[PDB]
Amino acid sequence: PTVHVEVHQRGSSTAKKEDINLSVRKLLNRHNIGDYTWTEFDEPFLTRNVQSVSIIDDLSACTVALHIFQLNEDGPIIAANHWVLPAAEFHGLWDSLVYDVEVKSHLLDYVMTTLLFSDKNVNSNLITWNRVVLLHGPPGTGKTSLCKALAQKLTIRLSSRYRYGQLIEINSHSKLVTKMFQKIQDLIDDKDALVFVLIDQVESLTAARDAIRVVNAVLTQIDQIKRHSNVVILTTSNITEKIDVAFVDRADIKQYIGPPSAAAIFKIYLSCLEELMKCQIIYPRQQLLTLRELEMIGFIENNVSKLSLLLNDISRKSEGLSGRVLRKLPFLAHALYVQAPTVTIEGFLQALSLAVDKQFEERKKLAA
Ligand SMILES: Nc1ncnc2c1ncn2[C@@H]1O[C@H](COP(=O)(O)OP(=O)(O)OP(=O)(O)O)[C@@H](O)[C@H]1O
Numbered sequence: 327p328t329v330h331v332e333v334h335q336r337g338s339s340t341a342k343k344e345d346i347n348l349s350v351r352k353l354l355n356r357h358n359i360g361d362y363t364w365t366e367f368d369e370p371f372l373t374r375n376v377q378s379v380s381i382i383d384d385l386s387a388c389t390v391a392l393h394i395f396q397l398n399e400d401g402p403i404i405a406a407n408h409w410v411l412p413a414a415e416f417h418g419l420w421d422s423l424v425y426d427v428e429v430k431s432h433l434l435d436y437v438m439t440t441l442l443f444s445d446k447n448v449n450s451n452l453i454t455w456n457r458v459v460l461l462h463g464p465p466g467t468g469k470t471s472l473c474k475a476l477a478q479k480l481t482i483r484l485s486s487r488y489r490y491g492q493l494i495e496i497n498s499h500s501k502l503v504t505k506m507f508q509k510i511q512d513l514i515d516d517k518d519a520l521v522f523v524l525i526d527q528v529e530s531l532t533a534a535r536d537a538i539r540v541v542n543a544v545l546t547q548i549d550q551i552k553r554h555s556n557v558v559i560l561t562t563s564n565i566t567e568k569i570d571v572a573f574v575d576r577a578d579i580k581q582y583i584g585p586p587s588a589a590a591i592f593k594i595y596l597s598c599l600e601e602l603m604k605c606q607i608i609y610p611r612q613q614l615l616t617l618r619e620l621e622m623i624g625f626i627e628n629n630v631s632k633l634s635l636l637l638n639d640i641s642r643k644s645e646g647l648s649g650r651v652l653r654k655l656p657f658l659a660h661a662l663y664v665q666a667p668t669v670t671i672e673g674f675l676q677a678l679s680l681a682v683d684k685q686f687e688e689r690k691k692l693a694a
Contacts, residue, residue, distance in 0.1 A: 330382045332482060333394040339375040343394045350379055350392055358386045395482045398490075403509045405500040409474075411481040411491025411522075420475035422597070423468045424590045424649070429581065430472070433459075434479055436579045437558060441484065441520075444555055456578040457552045460528075462563040463583035466648025469562040470495075470526055472583065477522040477560065488520040488556070496523070496544075498530040503540065507547040514554050523551065524560040528573045545572065585648050592617060592641035594649065595678070598656045599637075599671065607660070609668045636675050644682050655681045 333350050335343070349372050353364070363380035367373050397417055398410040409415060423430065436459075443455045450456065459476075461469040474493060481491030492513045496506075514521045525548075531541050551557050561573050566582060574580075586594060596616075602608040615623075615634035627635055644652060655678060660669075662684070663677035 327388050329385075329388040329390050330483070331390060331392050332378075332380050332382060333376060333392055334378040334380070335394055335396045336375055336377050337396060337399050339396070341371070341375045345371075346375055346394050347392055350376070350394075351390070353379065354390065360384060393482050393485055395485065403494065403506055405497050405502075406506055406509070407495040407497075409493045409495075411493055411520075412478050413493070416474050416478040419471055420479055422653075423472055423475060424586060424593045424597070425468075425583070426587045426590050429583065430476075433472070433476060433579075433581060434483075436581075437476065437480060438483075440579065441480070441487075441558070445487065454578055456576075457557055458559045458561065458573065458577040459579040459581070460561050460563065460573055460577040461581050461583050462566040464566065464585065464648070465564045466650035467583040467585060468649050469564075469583050470524075473522075473524050473560040473562060477524075477558075480522075480558070481520055484520060489518040491520045491522065493522045493524060496525050498525065498527045500540075503543045503547065507551070510551060514551060514557055517556055520556050520558070521551075521554075522558050522560055523548070524562075525573075526562055527564055528561045529563045529565045529568070529570055532571055585646070586652065588642045588645050589617060591644050591647075591652060592638055594652050595637055595641060595644075595656075598653065599674070602656065602660075602674065603671070607668060608671050608674050610670070612671050614671075633671060633675060640675065640679050640682060647682075647685060651685060655685065658684070 331350065331354070333346060335341075335346055339346075349369065353367065353369065353372065361381055361383055363378050365378050367376070367379075372379075395412050397412050397414040399414050401413065401415050402408045420430065440455050440457065443450075443453065444457065448455065459473075461472055463469060474495075477491060477493045481488065494510055494513075510521070510523060513519060525544075531544070535541060548559060552559055561577065563570060563573070596614060599608060599614065603611045612633065613630070614637065615631060617638065620631060620634060620638060623631060625631070625635060625638075644655075647655075656674075659674065659677040659681040663680050664673065669677070
């Protein structure tokens with residue numbers, strides 16, 4: 327039963343990966359026992375070369391797969407943003423996206439099997455696969471982030487097959503096309519690279535419809551690059567119910583992404599409050615309980631539970647908000663209702679509650 331361990335090698339490190347592979351395995355044998363991350367090590371070679379060793383889904387002998395990676399520090403071809411993968415900009419993006427249904431797992435597995443099928447030359451006339459992915463759902467769901475985070479994950483997890491990755495994010499809002507796709511082809515010519523091309527909000531092309539010619543040229547250019555073994559095409563759409571030309575039939579991986587449920591919201595807020603405690607904007611630090619812990623005490627209210635119960639109740643009246651709004655509310659909370667360097671978590675929860683109420687007042691104003 328395989329167990330994945332992501333090893334973040336320092337940018338300033340010049341050690342061979344084989345040496346890091348040997349150290350990290352020796353460390354894992356020391357401890358020998360859920361998801362856990364190391365940021366400090368007794369051993370100096372690890373201190374010197376590794377920023378984190380993180381175990382991702384209590385046991386010892388499993389088949390253990392390490393993925394050692396080194397963030398490419400400098401970020402960005404216009405109209406296109408370009409990142410070498412793994413990119414320092416996308417570090418932690420994956421974990422920042424909380425979904426209900428374990429969408430991220432399936433999404434990774436689908437594209438994994440797609441790349442495996444590409445790589446072994448499975449006749450697509452006999453088993454259905456292709457290099458196009460469509461994330462659709464309402465705005466603010468994390469679709470674009472999830473594409474970038476998926477590209478990063480795939481690159482980190484397929485280091486054995488590809489030495490590095492590439493992400494080109496075409497901005498829907500925009501001859502010159504042929505120059506930008508010349509650039510992308512030159513990246514693809516390096517078969518050590520796994521190249522991702524991301525077309526944000528594809529519905530914008532059929533909505534923005536000279537504009538006829540610009541669209542048909544991008545289609546023919548996409549059709550040209552999806553012919554290559556090391557290409558994945560990522561697309562998103564904010565109109566989920568509407569069929570679309572022509573990425574709908576274009577995509578053997580379609581995936582709905584919807585707004586967070588009250589459970590997901592709770593985990594989302596927890597990740598925000600943890601960060602504020604880490605940075606000590608919330609002080610002093612208090613323990614917060616998970617929903618599972620609350621459920622184990624029957625949601626009795628006491629000193630351990632009171633504030634976590636209050637957060638749970640804030641999560642419930644946040645239902646309806648998108649994740650974009652949700653990760654923005656702690657900033658609004660702090661800016662509108664604290665406006666001081668430091669606040670107890672009692673005071674912040676109460677600030678966040680007001681902010682939430684303020685969102686729906688604005689919503690109701692947009693209605694009338
Ligand atoms: N499920 C979620 N959990 C945590 N944060 C989220 C979630 N969904 C959205 N967000 C926050 O909102 C930010 C922006 O979302 P993003 O713009 O990727 O969503 P989108 O509107 O679906 O994408 P686009 O409109 O560009 O196609 C994310 O980086 C994330 O911080």
